[PDB]
Amino acid sequence: EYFPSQMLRTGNNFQFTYTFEDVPFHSSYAHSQSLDRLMNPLIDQYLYY
Amino acid sequence: LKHPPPQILIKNTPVPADPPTTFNQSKLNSFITQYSTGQVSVEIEWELQ
Helix, strand or coil: CCCCCCCCCCCCCCCCCCCCCCCCCCCCCCCCCCCCCCCCCCCCCCCCC | CCCCCCCCCCCCCCCECCCCCCCCCCCCCCECCCCCCCCCCCCCCCCCC
């Protein structure tokens, strides 16, 4: 009750608008590759293990 | 001469023979046997005493 508020009888209406801040797109997709399978399956590496 | 007429270098560009159909990393050692011919002109102006 310590905030300013609008009072409405039966003939009154209320409205406001709002803008969202920049936010990343929700990712609505599934990956067709897995993280451990990003290599070319034909070719050898030049690194050694 | 401190700055003599510059030396002129010429080479035939290597043309490989047919590579294998499976990839191999080593440099190709098979080429088409090849040579070239042509004409060359040189003109010099000489000062006389």
